[PDB]
Amino acid sequence: PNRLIVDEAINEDNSVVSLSQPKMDELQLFRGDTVLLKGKKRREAVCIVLSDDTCSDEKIRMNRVVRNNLRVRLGDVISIQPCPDVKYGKRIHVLPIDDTVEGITGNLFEVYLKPYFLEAYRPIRKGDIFLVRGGMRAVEFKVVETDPSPYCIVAPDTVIHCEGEPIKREDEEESLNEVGYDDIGGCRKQLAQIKEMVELPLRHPALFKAIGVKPPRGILLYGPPGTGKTLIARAVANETGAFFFLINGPEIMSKLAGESESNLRKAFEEAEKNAPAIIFIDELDAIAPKREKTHGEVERRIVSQLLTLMDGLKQRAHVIVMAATNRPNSIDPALRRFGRFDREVDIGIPDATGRLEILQIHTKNMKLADDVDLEQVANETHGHVGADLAALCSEAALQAIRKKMDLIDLEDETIDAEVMNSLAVTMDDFRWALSQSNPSALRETVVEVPQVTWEDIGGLEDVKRELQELVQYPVEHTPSKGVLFYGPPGCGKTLLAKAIANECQANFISIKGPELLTMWFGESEANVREIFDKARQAAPCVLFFDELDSIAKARGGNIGDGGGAADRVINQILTEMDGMSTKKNVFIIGATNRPDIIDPAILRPGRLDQLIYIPLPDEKSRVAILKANLRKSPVAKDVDLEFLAKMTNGFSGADLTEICQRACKLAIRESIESEIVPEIRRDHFEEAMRFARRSVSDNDIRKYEMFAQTLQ
Amino acid sequence: VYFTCPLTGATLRKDQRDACIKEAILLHFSTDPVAASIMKIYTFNKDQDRVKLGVDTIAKYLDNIHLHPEEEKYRKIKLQNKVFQERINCLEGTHEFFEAIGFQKVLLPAQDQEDPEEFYVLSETTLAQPQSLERHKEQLLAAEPVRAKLDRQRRVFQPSPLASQFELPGDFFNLTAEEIKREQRLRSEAVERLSVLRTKAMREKEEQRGLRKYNYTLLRVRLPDGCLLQGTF
Ligand SMILES: Nc1ncnc2c1ncn2[C@@H]1O[C@H](COP(=O)(O)OP(=O)(O)O)[C@@H](O)[C@H]1O
Numbered sequence: 054p055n056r057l058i059v060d061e062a063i064n065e066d067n068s069v070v071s072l073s074q075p076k077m078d079e080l081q082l083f084r085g086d087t088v089l090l091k092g093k094k095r096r097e098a099v100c101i102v103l104s105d106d107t108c109s110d111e112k113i114r115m116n117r118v119v120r121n122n123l124r125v126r127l128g129d130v131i132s133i134q135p136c137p138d139v140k141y142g143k144r145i146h147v148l149p150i151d152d153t154v155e156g157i158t159g160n161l162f163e164v165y166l167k168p169y170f171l172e173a174y175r176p177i178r179k180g181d182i183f184l185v186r187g188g189m190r191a192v193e194f195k196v197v198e199t200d201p202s203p204y205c206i207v208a209p210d211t212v213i214h215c216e217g218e219p220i221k222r223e224d225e226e227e228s229l230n231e232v233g234y235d236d237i238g239g240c241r242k243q244l245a246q247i248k249e250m251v252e253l254p255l256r257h258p259a260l261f262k263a264i265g266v267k268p269p270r271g272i273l274l275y276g277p278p279g280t281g282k283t284l285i286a287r288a289v290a291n292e293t294g295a296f297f298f299l300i301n302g303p304e305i306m307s308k309l310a311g312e313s314e315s316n317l318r319k320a321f322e323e324a325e326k327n328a329p330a331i332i333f334i335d336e337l338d339a340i341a342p343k344r345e346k347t348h349g350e351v352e353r354r355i356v357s358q359l360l361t362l363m364d365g366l367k368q369r370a371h372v373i374v375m376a377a378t379n380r381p382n383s384i385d386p387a388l389r390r391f392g393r394f395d396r397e398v399d400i401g402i403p404d405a406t407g408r409l410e411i412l413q414i415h416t417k418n419m420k421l422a423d424d425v426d427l428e429q430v431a432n433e434t435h436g437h438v439g440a441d442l443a444a445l446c447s448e449a450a451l452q453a454i455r456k457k458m459d460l461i462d463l464e465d466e467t468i469d470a471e472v473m474n475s476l477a478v479t480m481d482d483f484r485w486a487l488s489q490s491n492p493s494a495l496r497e498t499v500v501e502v503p504q505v506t507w508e509d510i511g512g513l514e515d516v517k518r519e520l521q522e523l524v525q526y527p528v529e530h531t532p533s534k535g536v537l538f539y540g541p542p543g544c545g546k547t548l549l550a551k552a553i554a555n556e557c558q559a560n561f562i563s564i565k566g567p568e569l570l571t572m573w574f575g576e577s578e579a580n581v582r583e584i585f586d587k588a589r590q591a592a593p594c595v596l597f598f599d600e601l602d603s604i605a606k607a608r609g610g611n612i613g614d615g616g617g618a619a620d621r622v623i624n625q626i627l628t629e630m631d632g633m634s635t636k637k638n639v640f641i642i643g644a645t646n647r648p649d650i651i652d653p654a655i656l657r658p659g660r661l662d663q664l665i666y667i668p669l670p671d672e673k674s675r676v677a678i679l680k681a682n683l684r685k686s687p688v689a690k691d692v693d694l695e696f697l698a699k700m701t702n703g704f705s706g707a708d709l710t711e712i713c714q715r716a717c718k719l720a721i722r723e724s725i726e727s728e729i730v731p732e733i734r735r736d737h738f739e740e741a742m743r744f745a746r747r748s749v750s751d752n753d754i755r756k757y758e759m760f761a762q763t764l765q
Numbered sequence: 766v767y768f769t770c771p772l773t774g775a776t777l778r779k780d781q782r783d784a785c786i787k788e789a790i791l792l793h794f795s796t797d798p799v800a801a802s803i804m805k806i807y808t809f810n811k812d813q814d815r816v817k818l819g820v821d822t823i824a825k826y827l828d829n830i831h832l833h834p835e836e837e838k839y840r841k842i843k844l845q846n847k848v849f850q851e852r853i854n855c856l857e858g859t860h861e862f863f864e865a866i867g868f869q870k871v872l873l874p875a876q877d878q879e880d881p882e883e884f885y886v887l888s889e890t891t892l893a894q895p896q897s898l899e900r901h902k903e904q905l906l907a908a909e910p911v912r913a914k915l916d917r918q919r920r921v922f923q924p925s926p927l928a929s930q931f932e933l934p935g936d937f938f939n940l941t942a943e944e945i946k947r948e949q950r951l952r953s954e955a956v957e958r959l960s961v962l963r964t965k966a967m968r969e970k971e972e973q974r975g976l977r978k979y980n981y982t983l984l985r986v987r988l989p990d991g992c993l994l995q996g997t998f
């Protein structure tokens with residue numbers, strides 16, 4: 054009773070914790086009441102309690118600053134003891150920690166402590182450590198004297214004193230600038246997977262010493278450079294308390310024969326002595342490259358030594374080995390056998406949401422101007438990884454620094470806190486840095502939740518329901534795990550696959566003709582296994598195979614070369630599909646404009662069992678399509694969209710879009726010419742009608758109808 | 766949460782509010798039948814949109830006879846009329862109001878049928894002085910539902926420093942087998958929930974489970990002099 058498990062914070066503020074409301078009702082404390090938290094080693098901290106809709110009934114959410122003051126870690130238990138007797142303070146004395154006040158001078162109170170405490174009414178206790186961010190520096194302070202004891206509320210009428218040399222950090226105190234879970238932006242799912250596998254054997258060693266079954270011995274983190282592979286490994290070690298040993302390929306390979314292998318096995322011995330511990334091996338492909346690709350004795354012997362060291366982990370209790378690589382297929386396959394490194398996690402490239410969170414983390418110490426919009430930046434930074442967003446914030450800061458430092462002119466060993474705190478980074482400084490920055494992962498495939506929703510697709514009301522049923526039924530109640538769309542081009546085949554991914558908040562993986570053709574022409578169809586493996590790692594996701602017959606067309610389509618219906622890639626697709634379960638949360642959607650020439654195997658039971666016909670839209674749907682296409686622009690009241698729909702009887706959705714964009718092209722030109730009118734007028738649509746034509750002939754509709762009648 | 770009934774002065778809980786007020790209104794008929802039926806029409810009926818239409822239609826019947834008090838065709842209100850049945854007959858207390866302001870319930874021959882129909886017929890005693898019905902019409906239209914007043918229960922408390930003095934057991938921080946298995950199960954379920962491919966309707970069904978717990982609040986104020994002030998809203 055009155056005890057909860059320590060969990061991650063949602064509110065980043067250092068003076069507050071969040072409880073689930075039912076526990077506040079049992080403790081009979083209100084939102085905003087001051088409570089004490091009882092931690093390990095007879096230590097306590099004072100904070101304010103609130104509540105939210107996400108905290109578990111049996112957990113307390115507190116950030117790193119509060120956990121460090123209690124000397125507790127995630128997964129521990131603390132007691133909550135309300136203390137309504139807390140009074141307002143009269144005088145407090147707060148001094149900085151030397152580790153964070155180096156190179157900076159000036160009046161720390163006016164810059165940091167004053168706005169931090171002013172009108173905040175934060176609880177304070179003697180011995181507390183708390184962090185105040187600003188001036189592009191993270192400065193933490195320790196409380197050395199409080200006139201009331203042992204804690205109070207710091208009110209606007211409380212005297213705040215700060216005189217004396219910075220305090221040297223104690224050996225039992227950890228720096229708040231060390232990487233933890235709050236420093237990781239996107240890839241929350243991947244971090245959760247690591248938690249499940251790693252935190253338990255490190256937080257509770259006694260659980261696994263009593264049994265003959267070992268926890269996972271190695272985890273392989275892969276993805277482009279700069280995505281957080283090392284950051285996750287360090288954050289987990291720092292949050293659980295396990296000793297972190299850093300190894301990398303170049304450090305071992307740069308050594309001479311004998312010394313190289315000695316250093317590798319010595320690090321493993323040190324981890325055992327310091328167990329529990331995590332051994333992180335960076336550039337695994339450099340320390341353990343495929344042996345069949347090299348003739349050197351050093352490379353082969355190091356691989357053999359690493360293989361035996363991994364096996365020795367059954368004796369080195371509580372040591373977990375993690376490795377980082379670019380691709381699981383760029384390392385010697387022996388490491389990936391049962392045991393050793395038999396768990397793989399795809400870190401990937403952050404999406405627009407993840408990129409925003411990463412920028413918000415980096416700017417924690419930065420003062421941003423009112424015109425700065427990090428969401429807009431995250432949308433523009435396509436192809437960037439966290440390492441590039443870190444450089445982006447640094448470059449934006451340096452540009453802002455130069456602009457004002459030319460006016461500050463402070464040339465000394467330290468820089469005043471006031472002149473740094475007055476510096477703000479503007480939108481022009483981020484845009485400048487964006488123009489100079491170059492993404493490191495631009496050529497890599499970017500997989501994210503699409504922005505196309507059901508309101509963007511005109512007509513097809515029944516197809517929308519069918520897709521929702523195919524995904525919802527196996528979860529609400531052998532259900533099919535894929536559907537093929539057939540029919541005329543430009544009717545929404547791709548949009549349907551995106552819209553269902555959107556509503557499900559699922560990742561959308563787009564496979565287009567050129568990619569299917571590249572695998573065919575280059576005899577690299579093995580990449581299909583990586584596509585399906587990406588779909589599994591990206592789950593929940595929708596794996597969309599567009600232009601399924603693109604290779605058949607490349608081979609002649611209606612004529613044909615050495616092949617016909619089946620090819621290298623579709624057969625690899627069949628291979629992977631037959632190994633995928635309905636419980637993998639991967640929904641496979643295909644699309645073709647020539648369903649008569651696709652390998653019939655793909656439609657056999659257990660594969661793409663569902664087939665949906667997408668005909669040309671009817672009259673009411675064509676109106677809906679025009680309205681959806683024009684939802685982003687001003688349209689005059691004289692525009693009769695129903696009249697246009699009545700004329701465009703044979704037009705596809707793609708053809709109606711051309712009309713809308715042509716009307717936009719004319720409307721925008723008139724506006725530009727007038728400036729050198731503000732809305733799209735009927736005259737612009739009537740002119741567009743003079744050029745727009747239907748792309749789907751009547752004979753092509755008969756071809757699709759006959760196929761639909763074949764299946765019924 | 767406590768309330769005061771404005772018709773009796775009784776102290777009630779949140780569930781006892783309608784029971785006491787309804788009983789007080791039904792008893793009030795012994796003092797002022799018109800005021801009691803007016804309270805019943807607004808208080809007993811939960812659908813206030815129908816109450817507004819009911820009292821507006823009743824006001825129109827009264828103004829019709831007020832304009833032409835010499836014509837007998839405005840003295841009788843037909844209980845089987847489509848408008849009366851939908852707006853007035855569907856409410857509790859509207860029949861009591863008609864009787865309270867001088868209408869008798871009688872059966873009159875129909876202008877085109879043998880079967881007598883139900884009418885509220887104004888008596889000559891009240892018809893002679895339209896000023897009585899005009900005042901009763903305004904008393905009905907200006908009325909509101911009767912609800913128990915929320916008791917603020919103003920209290921001040923003095924915290925006792927002794928409540929903050931407690932020492933934990935030495936084995937407090939040692940988690941049990943159930944606490945460790947539960948936490949690892951929640952970790953596996955949290956990873957699974959992120960992995961599940963589901964539609965928005967399935968997502969909302971679970972998220973919506975946290976939305977209905979409270980309709981009252983207790984507020985406290987921390988005062989500079991160390992006093993804790995509390996009240997109910
Ligand atoms: N997912 C991420 N979330 C937050 N920061 C990230 C992320 N990925 C990379 N970074 C940032 O980029 C840098 C990563 O550099 P480094 O420590 O060499 O790790 P790695 O090269 O393995 O990604 C750090 O500054 C880190 O904060």
Ligand SMILES: Nc1ncnc2c1ncn2[C@@H]1O[C@H](COP(=O)(O)OP(=O)(O)O)[C@@H](O)[C@H]1O
Nearest residue numbers: 510511542543544545546547548678706707710
């Ligand atoms: N049903 C529809 N509703 C709205 N717009 C559509 C529809 N069908 C096609 N379009 C328009 O056609 C364009 C191409 O659609 P897409 O689904 O990419 O065609 P395909 O699947 O044949 O490649 C889209 O940008 C969209 O504006």
